[PDB]
Amino acid sequence: AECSVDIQGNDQMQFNTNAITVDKSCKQFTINLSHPGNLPKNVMGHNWVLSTAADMQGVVTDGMASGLDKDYLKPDDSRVIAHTKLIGSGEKDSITFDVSKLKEGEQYMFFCTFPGHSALMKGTLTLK
Numbered sequence: 001a002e003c004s005v006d007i008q009g010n011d012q013m014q015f016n017t018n019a020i021t022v023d024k025s026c027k028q029f030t031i032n033l034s035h036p037g038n039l040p041k042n043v044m045g046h047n048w049v050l051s052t053a054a055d056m057q058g059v060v061t062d063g064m065a066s067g068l069d070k071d072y073l074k075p076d077d078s079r080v081i082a083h084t085k086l087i088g089s090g091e092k093d094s095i096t097f098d099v100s101k102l103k104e105g106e107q108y109m110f111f112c113t114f115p116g117h118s119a120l121m122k123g124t125l126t127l128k
């Protein structure tokens with residue numbers, strides 16, 4: 001089965017998906033994030049950040065506090081399972097992580113940790 005997904009975040013604070021499925025036979029999974037908007041990183045930056053559903057609020061809250069130079073993530077935040085870098089208009093970033101980090105049946109959320117974005121830019125990730 002395929003083990004990648006392409007995702008976009010725009011100037012309207014939208015991701016173009018709110019549900020990601022990772023096939024259970026994948027050993028790695030790749031997220032290709034792009035920003036088709038016109039606004040720069042420092043006002044409309046987007047990352048793709050993955051945690052358990054329960055950890056999302058904490059990661060987002062400490063993330064906002066950490067500032068732009070830390071990609072809006074608290075340093076050494078063990079709650080973050082995987083994440084792209086933060087990007088603005090016309091940029092793209094890819095990450096590849098181990099599916100060994102994703103247990104069957106557990107509930108995961110992906111979201112942007114740029115200030116104010118997460119309520120609008122979030123979705124589920126599940127293994128199937």
Ligand SMILES: [Cu+2]
Nearest residue numbers: 045046112117
């Ligand atoms: Cu964002």
